[PDB]
């Protein structure tokens, strides 16, 4: 039961997870279709922006370009979600067969194993409306503990945190479409009760 098979650090993955978002902003704002910096390579030059200025460029982003960004985040979460679910297949969980007729039985899979694998802990609560709408909860979403809010400007800080939520949107969308189809699935906020984010699915 206790498998001690090879491993790396959590911190470098968590910070790579965090810099997937300005990677997406950099790949959209620089599509190369015809203040910044400059670097020296051998007979070669690159020109970069830094991350927090690019999140501030998301604060000054166009509205249609903002949703053009957010498709890419759920696309990359979708890819890593379906491939990570495909590796979970090796685990041989006995809950499910295919097409998820009993939808909460694989909600008892994702909270038990997938969120344990990505974020080191279970999803602490799940509430069930029986029309397919299921109410996620976790008190502390793991890759936003390191995001420091500024001094008394939390209305900007909400708007600069919640575009980091499209990656687990991609995770749960990818593990659903590894098991057959696409249905609607959104985010929430759910201000926590004792000293983070909620999710809806069909």
């Amino acid at each position: 039961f206790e498998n001690s098979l090879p491993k790396v650090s959590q911190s470098v993955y968590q910070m790579l997870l965090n810099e997937m978002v300005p990677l997406a902003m950099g790949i959209e704002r620089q599509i190369s279709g015809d203040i910044k910096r400059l670097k020296i390579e051998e007979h070669h030059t690159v020109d970069i922006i830094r991350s927090h200025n690019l999140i501030h460029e998301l604060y000054k982003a166009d509205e249609e370009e903002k949703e053009k960004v957010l498709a890419r985040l759920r696309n990359i979460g979708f890819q890593i979600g379906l491939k990570l679910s495909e590796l979970l297949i090796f685990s041989n969980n006995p809950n499910l067969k295919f097409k998820e007729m009993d939808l909460l039985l694989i909600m008892k899979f994702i909270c038990r194993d997938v969120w344990k694998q990505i974020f080191g802990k279970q999803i602490d609560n799940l509430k069930t409306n029986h029309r397919g709408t299921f109410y996620l909860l976790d008190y502390d979403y793991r890759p936003i503990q390191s995001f420091s809010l500024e001094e008394d400007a939390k209305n900007e800080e909400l708007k600069m945190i919640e575009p980091f939520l499209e990656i687990p949107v991609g995770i749960i969308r990818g593990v659903l479409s590894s098991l057959g189809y696409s249905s609607e699935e959104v985010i929430c906020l759910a201000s926590f009760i004792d000293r983070g984010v909620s999710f809806h699915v069909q």
Binding site: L5, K7, V12, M15, M20, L23, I27, I76, L84, G120
Partner: protein, 184 residues
Amino acid sequence: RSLKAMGEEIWKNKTEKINTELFTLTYGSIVAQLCQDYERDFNKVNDHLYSMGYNIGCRLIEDFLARTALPRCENLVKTSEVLSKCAFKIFLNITPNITNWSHNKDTFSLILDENPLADFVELPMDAMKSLWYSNILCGVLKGSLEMVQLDCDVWFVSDILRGDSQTEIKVKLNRILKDEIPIG
């Protein structure tokens, strides 16, 4: 006490997780993004990977120095010691080897044994001759060393995925940065 002993020692108080099934396919998924968004360009992807690598190396050097408190390096003996004997030990659970320095010891190479960034990838035929895969590592080894007051330049020579020769990275001191003291 030794830099082998510290780098192995941090693995008793470091939070860990699986190196397959996460963290390989993160890099694979973002390089799939860069391949599909540039319509399979093979050299601009190296530039954007090196840019994101520079940013993550400049952000990672502080966690490396706060994890083990070490003095500022000055030559390519202490950097070639500290890299291969604790840095890839505590960030990737691996250890490379050092060879092919010059007569003035102003370079070395960075032969890597088990790269956990590319485990069973086997890149296709067109990308095999005009693409470097692990450019996030060359970005890290630029951006980390550029903040301990050394200008540097770190480049791949060959890797296992396209070539019979091993995975190695070449590197030049390219001078020592001068710390700016006065007011003006």
